[PDB]
Amino acid sequence: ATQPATAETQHIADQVRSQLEEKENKKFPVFKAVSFKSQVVAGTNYFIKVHVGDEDFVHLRVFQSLPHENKPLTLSNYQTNKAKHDELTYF
Numbered sequence: 001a002t003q004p005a006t007a008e009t010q011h012i013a014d015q016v017r018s019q020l021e022e023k024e025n026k027k028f029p030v031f032k033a034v035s036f037k038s039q040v041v042a043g044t045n046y047f048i049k050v051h052v053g054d055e056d057f058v059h060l061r062v063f064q065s066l067p068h069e070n071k072p073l074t075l076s077n078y079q080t081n082k083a084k085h086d087e088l089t090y091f
Contacts, residue, residue, distance in 0.1 A: 002088045005033035005048070012036075012073055013048050016062050019075040029053035037088055042066070045076070049088045057082040061091060 005013075013033040021027055032051040039045040046062040059079045065071040079091060 002035045002037045002047075002049070004035050009033040009036045009046075009048060012046055012062055012064070013050055013060065015073040016060060016075040020058070020060070020078060023075070023078070024080070035088060039090070047088055047090060049082070049086075051084075055084060056080075057084065057086065059086075059088060059091070 010033040013031065017028070017031050030051060030053045034049050034051055034057075036046055036048040039047070041063075043066050044064045046060070046064060048060045048062060050058050050060060052058050059082055060075060061077040063074045063076045077091060
């Protein structure tokens with residue numbers, strides 16, 4: 001289940017912000033992780049709801065490799081145009 005963001009969630013979000021900014025061709029007035037859920041695969045998928053200013057939100061899908069293969073966090077996919085009350089659905 002989705003849980004409120006911790007500092008670790010903000011760190012994961014921060015590591016992919018530039019990938020998002022590049023794909024969106026803009027910068028964000030704010031980038032605050034608010035909640036997340038995680039999913040074990042071969043590695044771990046993090047789904048993160050992030051406030052990006054004015055009651056706008058983005059949902060991120062971030063892939064984290066297992067520690068032992070030392071690869072950075074990658075942005076697998078994202079959804080923009082989300083609201084504060086929107087469920088953090090898998091996608």
